Amino acid sequence: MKYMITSKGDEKSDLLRLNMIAGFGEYDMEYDDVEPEIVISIGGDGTFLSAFHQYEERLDEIAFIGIHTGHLGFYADWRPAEADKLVKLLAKGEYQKVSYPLLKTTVKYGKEATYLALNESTVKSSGGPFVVDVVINDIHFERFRGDGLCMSTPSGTTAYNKSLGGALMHPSIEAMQLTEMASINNRVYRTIGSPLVFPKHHVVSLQPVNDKDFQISVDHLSILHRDVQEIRYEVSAKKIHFARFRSFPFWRRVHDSFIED
Amino acid sequence: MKYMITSKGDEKSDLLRLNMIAGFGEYDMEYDDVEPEIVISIGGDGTFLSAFHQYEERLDEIAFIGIHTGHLGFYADWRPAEADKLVKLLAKGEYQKVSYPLLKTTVKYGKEATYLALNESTVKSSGGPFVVDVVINDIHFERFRGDGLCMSTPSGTTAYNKSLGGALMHPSIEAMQLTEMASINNRVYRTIGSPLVFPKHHVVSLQPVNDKDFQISVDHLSILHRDVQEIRYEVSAKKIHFARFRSFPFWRRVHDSFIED
Amino acid sequence: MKYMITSKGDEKSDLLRLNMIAGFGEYDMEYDDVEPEIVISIGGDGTFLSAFHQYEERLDEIAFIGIHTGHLGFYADWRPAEADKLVKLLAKGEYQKVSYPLLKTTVKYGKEATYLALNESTVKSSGGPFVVDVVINDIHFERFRGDGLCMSTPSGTTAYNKSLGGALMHPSIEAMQLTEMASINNRVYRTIGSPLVFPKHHVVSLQPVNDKDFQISVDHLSILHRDVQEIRYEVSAKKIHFARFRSFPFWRRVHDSFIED
Amino acid sequence: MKYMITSKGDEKSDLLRLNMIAGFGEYDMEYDDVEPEIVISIGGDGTFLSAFHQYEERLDEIAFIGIHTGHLGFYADWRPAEADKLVKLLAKGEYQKVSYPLLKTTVKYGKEATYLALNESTVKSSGGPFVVDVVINDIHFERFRGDGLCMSTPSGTTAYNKSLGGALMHPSIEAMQLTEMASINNRVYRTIGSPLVFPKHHVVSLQPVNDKDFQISVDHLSILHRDVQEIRYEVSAKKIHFARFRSFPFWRRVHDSFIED
Numbered sequence A, B, C, D: 001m002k003y004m005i006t007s008k009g010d011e012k013s014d015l016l017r018l019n020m021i022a023g024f025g026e027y028d029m030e031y032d033d034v035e036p037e038i039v040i041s042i043g044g045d046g047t048f049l050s051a052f053h054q055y056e057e058r059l060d061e062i063a064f065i066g067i068h069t070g071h072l073g074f075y076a077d078w079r080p081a082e083a084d085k086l087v088k089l090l091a092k093g094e095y096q097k098v099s100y101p102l103l104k105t106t107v108k109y110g111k112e113a114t115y116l117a118l119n120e121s122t123v124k125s126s127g128g129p130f131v132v133d134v135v136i137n138d139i140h141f142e143r144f145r146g147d148g149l150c151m152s153t154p155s156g157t158t159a160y161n162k163s164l165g166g167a168l169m170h171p172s173i174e175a176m177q178l179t180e181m182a183s184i185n186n187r188v189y190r191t192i193g194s195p196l197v198f199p200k201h202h203v204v205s206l207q208p209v210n211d212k213d214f215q216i217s218v219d220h221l222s223i224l225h226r227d228v229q230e231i232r233y234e235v236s237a238k239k240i241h242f243a244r245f246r247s248f249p250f251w252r253r254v255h256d257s258f259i260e261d
């Protein structure tokens, strides 16, 4: 019943938001942006990402929906001309919910900060060279030296992960995927090169070697952390829920976005 | 109780086999290569692969063990000097079993042949250009034109898959991964490029466009199929079982094989 | 004055050929397919490649021209609607000539065969594993184990070379470029991975390690060589000459073929 | 006759410098760090890079020599134990000189700054997304959106260029090579992907689309430029000269650094 709508803030998106609010006024639907059950995002994937983070403390109580006013988004995958048909079906309800895994990032100091990502979490150096020891379930795997690392959710595999050579994986797979950014590899320095796909309950830990200052990005929020002792990655126990009103399979979403629509 | 041992057939491996048979003679163990419960492979990964295919019709009744007489194998991951300690622990039994997913390939004609793979199944043209339509769960995904395609199990991701840019994935993930071989991409021709990771119950189907003759390889068995109507890939319902006597984690096996041992 | 025209042999291309012959009949131009000075290819890049090889023994006496009846070719880069304007300017003559480097392949036995390539020369195994020692100017560089190797001219860098990760290089650079096909890289096996760009007068030599039978392709002619002692690559001293009637820069040809036309 | 020596500043390198100065005292050699003819760098490639930039205004009057106190450098390719044999041969002189191409970067504002690079020049965004139009000899080639671009000299192709997928090219080739950093490629955005190798006299120009602030790195000097109108790349007319006392071929240097020494 409760719902809210975020807008990219351009003219196209604000007006669509006002028309859907007016349309919702004709049903037993209450606009509440403090404890919504339905969160509608109008813009692009960036706008959907912002809506996710705005409500990340009530993920289990919310079903998300993305409307793309521009080109197709991987998250905002319904067209504005569908808005009225969307208002109807939401109002009635009785829709199915679809869940995607999320990535948990923990940053320890010398204290602890955790973040939830829908696309990916990346780490780079704050200026100096990036050198980190990569530990998988407490086993020292490799010493990474290069530009940085990117740890992706399944639904993020079509975003930054894709541009770094990562594999695309179906979002029903509870996993995370680590890809390299420009690693150095010579007689002295050696990384695996290949992307790595980790299952639930595996912990990947980055440990500093020299500099302890890192720029850490969660989705498109980039934050400089100082005095870093460890960055820990693992598939979250939390999941994001999408209201789904029709079949739009992931691989078809992939075909439409990258091959031809 | 029943068991058998395959050997690479060189002097090192035959002698180790004879010594383990002699060692087994000192326990309630019967050498039976028709209905073994324990299959021991002595050689390299190729030798383990051959042992897998020799007994693929009794996978649920067999626990496999690989001994590497040469360099570390991903499947033959115990050292010859461990043979006597291996005979002991097998004899007693009471070991844990570890299962890895397998890949099912179906080839249809104008009749049907199916194959089980532990590493991967690849398709190439019998001489002409390789052009196939790639259909994912009955959705036309792309038209692939190039050298060929490779579909990998999780434990195969460190084999051919790795050399083609595929991601490495932990074998506890019930999935298969498709990688391209030298795809052409220009104004007229368009593939996804990225590896694709499919979950259980997804069906990837290759459909010929012009030539219907393909060289299909399952592990390192390469067979020319004529008059091909479809090649269908999916995670098998069958699994391979390994007798495990100690912890040797996959990511540590990966580190030892590729980073440094 | 002397000239000839090859055709892809479909209806579109044969008719264009007949109309250009008729058009040439109106000038001091003689159709001679034994000692042409102007060779016109009507079809696609494959048709231009065949025309190149048909006359590779008179490369210094011939200027080539490609007309693409289908999509833009990198070699057949003029449109059929330009045919009449082409006949005119050829007839008069006084056009500029443009030269592209070529690749020389030498195959030695236990005797010698040499081949000239306009796109590339590739080597693969005749069935077994491909293992070759790579020697650069008599220095042992690496042992390559994998699917095969591809050695490209500059103008071939947009063809097979491109699909294997090679760099695109401007054809005014007298060089050749070696790219890997699916090399194995682990503790035991080590290749450079990166494409290699060699200047004029450098000799790259492939030397067999075990099997001496290789499938060698020059452009799209694939030939099984038995009892191979060495394959030697070097930039040819010979060059292919194009009649050029207007500016169509390589990088613009690249943009039109791969980015958008 | 005039010469100077730079040191990494650790104990190993300072002492080697003092011993070579003492050794030079026994010949007609004058220590002059204002107008040297011979510049000796003792440290690693970073130390050689700093020596290059210290004297980039007298490149035509200087022959450089690199001594590596740590692992082999691509520029500092002589061993400390060779120092005394080095002092001798320098003193006499009569050595051959070897020249490598350099990269010229021009940055225009709304004024002009130029820089010379021995390894590469890279461009990234000052925080926002990196979006630049890539113009080759005044032809609009592509719109690049992603992490950044890297433009490499031939001798830089084994440095950052290598980690980004670039080809390795022999330094006798007067060229520069452009590689992408994590480009986005989907229905809306399209780059060539492949590295590009440009000959002498080609001009690659980056032109801003939205944000005009870029972090530009020349070798390992990273500088934030504001109010940028254009970045222009081209092979320099200037060259760096190495004193060479024996054969150490580039491809052997490549083998030693990456394959095995």
Ligand SMILES: C#CCCCN(CC#Cc1nc2c(N)ncnc2n1[C@@H]1O[C@H](CNC(=O)NCC)[C@@H](O)[C@H]1O)C[C@H]1O[C@@H](n2cnc3c(N)ncnc32)[C@H](O)[C@@H]1O
Pocket (backbone or CB within 6 Å): A044, A045, A046, A049, A072, A073, A074, A075, A119, A120, A155, A156, A157, A158, A159, A160, A161, A163, A219, A220, D128, D129, D130, D145, D146, D147, D181, D182, D183, D184, D186
């Ligand atoms: C800048 C800016 C404003 C947009 C912020 N943006 C929103 C998004 C998204 C998003 N999620 C997915 C997805 N799950 N599946 C497929 N498409 C997806 N997209 C698409 O990415 C584009 C927007 N991103 C950029 O232009 N990035 C700068 C190169 C649009 O086409 C979206 O539809 C943040 C995300 O940027 C991704 N990103 C960052 N650097 C990247 C790079 N070098 N290459 C590719 N992606 C990169 C990263 O993952 C991050 O979370």
Ligand SMILES: C#CCCCN(CC#Cc1nc2c(N)ncnc2n1[C@@H]1O[C@H](CNC(=O)NCC)[C@@H](O)[C@H]1O)C[C@H]1O[C@@H](n2cnc3c(N)ncnc32)[C@H](O)[C@@H]1O
Pocket (backbone or CB within 6 Å): B044, B045, B046, B049, B072, B073, B074, B075, B119, B120, B155, B156, B157, B158, B159, B160, B161, B163, B219, B220, C128, C129, C130, C145, C146, C147, C181, C182, C183, C184, C186
């Ligand atoms: C030839 C020959 C004789 C050996 C047959 N061989 C056995 C195996 C294996 C195997 N399984 C795995 C694994 N799960 N994890 C990591 N290592 C693994 N290996 C290792 O591969 C090497 C042997 N293969 C080759 O030399 N291939 C020719 C280039 C050895 O080091 C093994 O320890 C078959 C397998 O070959 C793989 N293969 C084929 N073409 C490849 C290529 N171009 N690059 C890389 N691998 C390739 C493919 O996957 C196939 O099933």
Ligand SMILES: C#CCCCN(CC#Cc1nc2c(N)ncnc2n1[C@@H]1O[C@H](CNC(=O)NCC)[C@@H](O)[C@H]1O)C[C@H]1O[C@@H](n2cnc3c(N)ncnc32)[C@H](O)[C@@H]1O
Pocket (backbone or CB within 6 Å): B128, B129, B130, B145, B146, B147, B181, B182, B183, B184, B186, C044, C045, C046, C049, C072, C073, C074, C075, C119, C120, C155, C156, C157, C158, C159, C160, C161, C163, C219, C220
């Ligand atoms: C099959 C068939 C019939 C065509 C024969 N064909 C002619 C050509 C050409 C050619 N030269 C260039 C060039 N200099 N610049 C850019 N485009 C170019 N093309 C284009 O390639 C396409 C035709 N090739 C294929 O379809 N190959 C099978 C995948 C067409 O679009 C041409 O316009 C031979 C050439 O095939 C190339 N080839 C082979 N295997 C490849 C692969 N896996 N990926 C990419 N290219 C491959 C190789 O280099 C060879 O010489």
Ligand SMILES: C#CCCCN(CC#Cc1nc2c(N)ncnc2n1[C@@H]1O[C@H](CNC(=O)NCC)[C@@H](O)[C@H]1O)C[C@H]1O[C@@H](n2cnc3c(N)ncnc32)[C@H](O)[C@@H]1O
Pocket (backbone or CB within 6 Å): A128, A129, A130, A145, A146, A147, A181, A182, A183, A184, A186, D044, D045, D046, D049, D072, D073, D074, D075, D119, D120, D155, D156, D157, D158, D159, D160, D161, D163, D219, D220
């Ligand atoms: C940091 C730091 C201090 C060193 C500064 N350093 C000096 C150099 C060099 C150099 N020139 C060459 C060459 N022509 N041929 C082959 N080896 C070469 N190296 C080697 O690079 C290593 C040092 N660089 C780094 O560790 N970079 C951070 C990842 C050492 O092994 C050198 O022997 C600057 C150069 O860094 C290169 N660089 C930057 N980011 C890179 C990346 N992500 N991957 C690979 N290289 C990168 C870039 O090109 C720049 O000019």
